[PDB]
Design an enzyme around this catalytic site. Sequence first.
Site, mmCIF file in Angstrom:
data_model
loop_
_atom_site.group_PDB
_atom_site.id
_atom_site.type_symbol
_atom_site.label_atom_id
_atom_site.label_comp_id
_atom_site.label_asym_id
_atom_site.label_seq_id
_atom_site.Cartn_x
_atom_site.Cartn_y
_atom_site.Cartn_z
ATOM 1 C CB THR A 69 -1.129 0.060 1.073
ATOM 2 O OG1 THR A 69 -2.161 -0.887 0.739
ATOM 3 C CG2 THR A 69 -1.760 1.455 1.115
ATOM 4 C CD1 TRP A 111 -1.744 -5.921 2.368
ATOM 5 C CD2 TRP A 111 -1.336 -6.892 4.353
ATOM 6 N NE1 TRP A 111 -2.465 -5.242 3.336
ATOM 7 C CE2 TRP A 111 -2.235 -5.823 4.555
ATOM 8 C CE3 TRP A 111 -0.921 -7.647 5.464
ATOM 9 C CZ2 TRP A 111 -2.724 -5.483 5.827
ATOM 10 C CZ3 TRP A 111 -1.420 -7.328 6.713
ATOM 11 C CH2 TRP A 111 -2.305 -6.249 6.888
ATOM 12 C CG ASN A 157 -5.039 -7.720 3.971
ATOM 13 O OD1 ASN A 157 -5.746 -7.610 4.980
ATOM 14 N ND2 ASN A 157 -4.897 -6.742 3.080
ATOM 15 C CD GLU A 158 -9.678 -5.914 2.042
ATOM 16 O OE1 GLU A 158 -10.316 -6.090 0.980
ATOM 17 O OE2 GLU A 158 -10.162 -5.334 3.050
ATOM 18 C CD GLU A 234 -6.936 -3.106 6.761
ATOM 19 O OE1 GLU A 234 -6.317 -4.148 6.475
ATOM 20 O OE2 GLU A 234 -7.069 -2.156 5.962
ATOM 21 N NE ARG A 356 -12.569 1.064 1.606
ATOM 22 C CZ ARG A 356 -11.330 1.390 1.969
ATOM 23 N NH1 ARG A 356 -10.876 1.049 3.167
ATOM 24 N NH2 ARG A 356 -10.536 2.055 1.139
#
EC number: 3.2.1.46
Length: 640
Positions: A69, A111, A157-158, A234, A356
């Site tokens: 990120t 990640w 992650n995600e 998160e 968000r």
Amino acid sequence: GAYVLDDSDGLGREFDGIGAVSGGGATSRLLVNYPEPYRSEILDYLFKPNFGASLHILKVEIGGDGQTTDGTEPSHMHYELDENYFRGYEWWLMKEAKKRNPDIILMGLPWSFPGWLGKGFSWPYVNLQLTAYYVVRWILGAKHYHDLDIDYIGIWNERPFDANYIKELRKMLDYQGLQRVRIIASDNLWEPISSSLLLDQELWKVVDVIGAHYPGTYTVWNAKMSGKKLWSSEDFSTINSNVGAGCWSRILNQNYINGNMTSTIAWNLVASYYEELPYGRSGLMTAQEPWSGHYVVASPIWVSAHTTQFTQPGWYYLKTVGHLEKGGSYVALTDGLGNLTIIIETMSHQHSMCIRPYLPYYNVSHQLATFTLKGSLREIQELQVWYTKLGRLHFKQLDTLWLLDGSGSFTLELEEDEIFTLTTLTTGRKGSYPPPPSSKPFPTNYKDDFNVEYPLFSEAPNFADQTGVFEYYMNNEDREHRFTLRQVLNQRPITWAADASSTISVIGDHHWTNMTVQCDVYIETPRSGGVFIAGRVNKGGILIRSATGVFFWIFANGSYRVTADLGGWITYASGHADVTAKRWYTLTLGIKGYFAFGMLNGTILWKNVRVKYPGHGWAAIGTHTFEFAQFDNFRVEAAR
Ligand SMILES: *[C@@H]1O[C@H](CO)[C@@H](O[C@@H]2O[C@H](CO)[C@@H](O)[C@H](O)[C@H]2NC(C)=O)[C@H](O)[C@H]1NC(C)=O
Ligand SMILES: *[C@@H]1O[C@H](CO)[C@@H](O[C@@H]2O[C@H](CO)[C@@H](O)[C@H](O)[C@H]2NC(C)=O)[C@H](O)[C@H]1NC(C)=O
Ligand SMILES: *[C@@H]1O[C@H](CO)[C@@H](O[C@@H]2O[C@H](CO)[C@@H](O)[C@H](O)[C@H]2NC(C)=O)[C@H](O)[C@H]1NC(C)=O
Ligand SMILES: O=[N+]([O-])c1ccc(O[C@@H]2O[C@H](CO)[C@H](O)[C@H](O)[C@H]2O)cc1
Ligand SMILES: *[C@@H]1O[C@H](CO)[C@@H](O)[C@H](O)[C@H]1NC(C)=O
Ligand SMILES: [Ca+2]
């Protein structure tokens, strides 16, 4: 009107803790080279009990060498057969956290992954045992090299989970004597993990916690039915102004109230990354200037305190929590030891928007609230009072509230954007260190010769890698370049984000517009190898593929190119040059107004080449692909 707080009809859910994320990606990059005492002060504001944010939980990225990120984070296994448990800064950070709070809860989550795990594909589920072996190595290393007990391990992650992977990860954990380590899943949305757990008993057994991201204070039915602990694993990700502090305040209460979530974890822990990188300044506090020592103890620190100082993992929520009549919310917790904590929030819509999700308008207006200690709470006579007002007064202790009756009841006047913590606990403190130095821009003259023999961290300060990984490198078989900086990835990671096709590390001040960058470069790969230095680099992080600027490339086939973009589609100049592999060259790049020039070994290669203007951005170094290369004697001279 009246709000009953009672434990007589039993208790609500067990509270598991508030925490924050360091990682996803390189969010703590600039913290490590803070001078003392400032570095230790920042850590205290975060982790020291009865002081600052006093966090119960620290979640960190398990670096996989990919961009995650705001940079890449180094893996413990760059290649097959490689193991090293001293790279990066998450080891150090966990140890600093544990030093201040021995009972802190530690979590790890990947990640990205190194490419070699994919055995030919960009996919971590090609060989389930291999990927689980890699993850479990990390947990063992934490114990063996750092005396760290990781409490929770996540999946990807995600990104999608594989139910067979989660099962193999449990089996592998148990096989390596890590029965105590819990699994959290799937660090994405409520589905499909929630329904998977209802349809598959074997999966239900191996998953201890359902961790969902940015759930907007709500859960879903399948999750409640699982009877698993529900965490907002998160959340936040909002600029740490008062606006962000309001968002944090509201979700800390309402994640439990509206969604039965008993933990909330903020991304991210501290904004220690260049603010012009994606999601700048979305940490609980700010520490993005190690060269000056300036840090900001932002509003969210104190909002955390309103819960963290007066609650601990293992406490319980009461059944009696909910929303206030005219807006806002109240939660209450006890510990089974006669203590009680009340946290009240009145965050106005206009001043509590999280990024968000964005909430449709809701009203908050002046009101009064009456609380009555029913059940075994009535026997309490006295409450400490902590007050915060956003928009400002922060974490101020007010005069004690004496019940003074035999009633067991009391009343409050609540306006907008306020937090009140009422507790039997006396341990509260608005921790304070003297103010730290004024903010100063990045040094307009800067050099690093990388001449450090026993580095405390694996990479030189202030170089934030955005694709690839750059490390201190010692080469005994050379005297003139014994200590260098080397890009060490030889293949693309299993990426999380869209890493560039070229490696790159950025440094300095994004406001720089006129600059001279110099570096000794060294290409390791014959015929095909290439390196560059750059200036006015304007984007990085998840947007690193988009970076424009001025890029001075040299190739081992005897050529150079000047480009406007990292992807090298837009040519400013190109030509031939006396360049081969395994030879040290000094590169100079001068950028001023509309014009650029490049030097090779102090001799002009190209001059007065037109670049786009105005333009501003960092200096950088890098390699053409995922390939070995070294850099030495870096210098930058720039005007902001
Ligand atoms: C999850 O929390 C919810 C509230 O968000 C609880 O659901 C009910 O909520 C109503 C209205 O607030 C209360 O009057 C009831 O006490 C709750 N019903 C139940 C099931 O007791 C609910 O308790 C929680 N769900 C769980 C723990 O499974
Ligand atoms: C309120 O909470 C505090 C914090 O745990 C409790 O204080 C501890 O209590 C245990 C036994 O109950 C002692 O062995 C510890 O030494 C205590 N620590 C401190 C800070 O003194 C306390 O018992 C709880 N009850 C109240 C209202 O005082
Ligand atoms: C970067 O360099 C440019 C070019 O030297 C500077 O812009 C010039 O500034 C002078 C006055 O200071 C003007 O008279 C020129 O017309 C400008 N050139 C152009 C093409 O605009 C600029 O000031 C420098 N920026 C910084 C902050 O160092
Ligand atoms: O595009 N989205 O909606 C999106 C939602 C959640 C995402 O997960 C998170 O986002 C954070 C930024 O807000 C950080 O990038 C974090 O690394 C990432 O896990 C990443 C992208
Ligand atoms: C919010 O509600 C209050 C009290 O009911 C009312 O006075 C006010 O006009 C409302 N504000 C808006 C703009 O919705
Ligand atoms: Ca050197």
